[PDB]
């Protein structure tokens, strides 16, 4: 959920106070005052849409930063920055291959933790082996100790 | 959001 909380960070927080007032409104129909699954149904009919107990509960999961089983206010910010289809360039076989050429610096086919640390250190931004290794895992669903390209897709899926 | 909030059309 660090993408939605980064949007929170990268965007202004007065929109977040706006969503706080909207969440105060989201006590209406809320036997909890919050946005739970049922409360997401009623908040969305208060918001205009209506997701499903799976869609409401999954947005909950999709806003479960803490795993609070609800859409909390912070989770409601996540929601408002979460209910569309925008993450672009769909980097896949073609584009993530263009990338994997450098992700897998090796010109071989595996972003090992060294390939990943090198690519990150090349990003210019601050790099941690927490970063490098969490991203290894996001890769290493096959768990090669080294991000394969399928691991690379389980890692950078849609991410741009 | 716009047509709903009318004069206060703010969120989206």
């Amino acid at each position: 959920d660090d993408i939605y909380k980064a949007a929170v960070e990268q965007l202004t927080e007065e929109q977040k106070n706006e969503f706080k007032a909207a969440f105060d409104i989201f006590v209406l129909g809320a036997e909890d005052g919050c946005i739970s699954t049922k409360e997401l149904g009623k908040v969305m009919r208060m918001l205009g849409q209506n997701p499903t107990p799976e869609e409401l509960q999954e947005m909950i999961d999709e806003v479960d930063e803490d795993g609070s089983g609800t859409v909390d206010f912070d989770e409601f910010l996540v929601m408002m920055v979460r209910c569309m289809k925008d993450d672009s360039k769909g980097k896949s076989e073609e584009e993530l291959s263009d990338l994997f050429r450098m992700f897998d610096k090796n010109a071989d086919g595996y972003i090992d933790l060294d390939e990943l640390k090198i690519m990150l250190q090349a990003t210019g931004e601050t790099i941690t082996e927490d970063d490098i290794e969490e991203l290894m895992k996001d890769g290493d669903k096959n768990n090669d100790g080294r991000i394969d390209y399928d691991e690379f897709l389980e890692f950078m899926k849609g991410v741009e | 959001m716009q047509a709903l909030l009318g004069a206060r059309a703010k969120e989206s």
Binding site: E31, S36, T37, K38, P53 | -
Partner: protein
């Protein structure tokens, strides 16, 4: 006299209805809260099913 009887019938009605509305409102909230729980039991029932079914698998 009839208007007062009507005041009493529309007021009693309102009170009977408020009582009924309250019974139905409580049943609504009771069934809604319990629905969320019944759904959570279904999620848990399906969850325990999946844990055991997955073990079966």
């Amino acid at each position: 006299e009839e208007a007062e009887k009507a005041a009493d019938e529309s007021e009693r009605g309102m009170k009977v209805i408020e009582s009924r509305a309250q019974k139905d409102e409580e049943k609504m909230e009771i069934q809604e809260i319990q629905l969320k729980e019944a759904k959570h039991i279904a999620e848990d029932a399906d969850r325990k099913y999946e844990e055991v079914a997955r073990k079966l698998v």
